[PDB]
Amino acid sequence: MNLMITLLTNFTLATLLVTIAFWLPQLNVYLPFSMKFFLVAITFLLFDLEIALLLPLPWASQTTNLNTMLTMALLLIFLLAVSLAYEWTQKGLEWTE
Amino acid sequence: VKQDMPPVGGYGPIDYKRNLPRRGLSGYSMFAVGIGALLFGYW
């Protein structure tokens, strides 16, 4: 509730400052497609999904199945690294390396 | 006469070569300090 008030206050202040900046000086009279950018955006998306898999780790370390948890955590970070290594060696990270 | 001239003994030696003083620790010392900071933090 306090958060909704704070978001509404920040949005209201930002909209008020933008409305000032677009209407205070009104008082005075006075591309070809690049495959490389798409590939870096998709590589971001895929690694961002891998990060979404990695995000419950500070809670996952609290388990009583720690051998399994440590195995799966290292396996997810390893598969993120194998994704990066495949992206590296097949020239996917080139001219924007 | 009134002529701009260098002095009798001449001017001093002007330094012109590159002087990079080579400061800092060794590579092994910097990795030892960094790993020691890691071990202190871990302990």
């Binding site: 008030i5 202040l13 900046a21 000086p25 500070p58 990066l84 590296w88 990270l93 | 960094g34 890691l38």
Partner: protein
């Protein structure tokens, strides 16, 4: 009474952003063997006020924009997200004490690329859109190491709670067990805010169609982001002493550390040339990301092998 607390957060944000411009011009003056602004105010203190009054009455640039709606929404979104990044910050107490404040900040900072994307598309210039796409690709690249470094650090915290991160650093700064994460974090926050040596929006090798007013709004959102990421880096790695009966000790201490870290941003822009675009892509994808994955494995496995798993609550 809560609205007073919201205003005493967000209006001093705007004042500190206003005087960060003075601090930047003075520090970049005295590091370049000259003086900064010292003519307008006493010790130059009225230069941001005069510059704000100059920008508010400057002529509108009058763009024939592709969309009026996203042209308005990009400064609104940039300023709103710049102000909402401050509300979970524990200094020592946050405005909004939320359990997942770290993840909240990561999500609200991931949303800030839409201001770049919408301002680049809302401009007619194809080259403004090309620069916007380069800036978005840079920002989403360094968000990856932001997320993974922050996850690796919070493996020592126990939770996503920003206020717990003060408890985590009562015996030692967290820069001592995590200085490689700290330095890749600091360079990644430097590349997040489009800040030198990562400012390719100022190099000749996206918001040029805005008037002086909305350019000032994007600029003050950017400096709010700079001060905020330095405060968040301070809370994250250089956590101060907190006495619960004297909270101002924590506030003075984190404020001094955050000011020194913002001045370190100013030192860095006055010391190095820019990266070429492929070079900072190389810096992310081929240097910071392999080390960040290796250190994420190490900071998963290290609390288990040392029996130093932090508490959940």
């Amino acid at each position: 009474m809560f609205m007073i607390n919201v205003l005493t957060l967000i209006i001093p944000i705007l004042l500190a952003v206003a005087f960060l411009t003075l601090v930047e011009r003075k520090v970049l003056g005295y590091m370049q063997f000259r003086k900064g602004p010292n003519v307008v105010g006493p010790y130059g203190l009225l230069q941001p006020i005069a510059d704000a009054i100059k920008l508010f009455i400057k002529e509108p640039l009058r763009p024939a924009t592709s969309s009026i709606s996203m042209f308005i929404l990009a400064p609104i979104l940039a300023l709103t997200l710049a102000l909402t990044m401050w509300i979970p910050l524990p200094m020592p107490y946050p405005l909004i004490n939320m359990n997942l404040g770290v993840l909240f900040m990561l999500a609200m900072s991931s949303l800030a690329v839409y201001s770049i994307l919408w301002s680049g598309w809302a401009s007619n210039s194809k080259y403004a859109l090309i620069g916007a796409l380069r800036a978005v690709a840079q920002t989403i690249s360094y968000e990856v190491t932001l997320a993974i470094i922050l996850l690796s650090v919070l493996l020592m915290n126990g939770s996503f709670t920003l206020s717990t991160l003060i408890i985590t650093q009562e015996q030692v700064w967290l820069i001592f067990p995590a200085w490689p994460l700290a330095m890749m974090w600091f360079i990644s926050t430097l590349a997040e805010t489009n800040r030198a040596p990562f400012d390719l929006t100022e190099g000749e090798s996206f918001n040029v169609e805005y008037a002086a007013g909305p350019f000032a709004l994007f600029f003050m959102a950017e400096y709010a982001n700079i001060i905020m990421m330095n405060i968040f880096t301070t809370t994250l790695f250089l956590g101060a002493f907190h006495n619960p009966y004297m909270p101002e000790l924590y506030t003075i201490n984190f404020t001094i550390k955050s000011l020194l870290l913002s001045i370190t941003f100013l030192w860095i822009r006055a010391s190095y040339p820019r990266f070429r675009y492929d070079q900072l892509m190389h810096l992310l994808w081929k240097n910071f990301l392999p080390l960040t994955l290796a250190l994420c494995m190490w900071h998963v496995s290290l609390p288990i092998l040392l029996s130093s798993i932090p508490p959940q609550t």
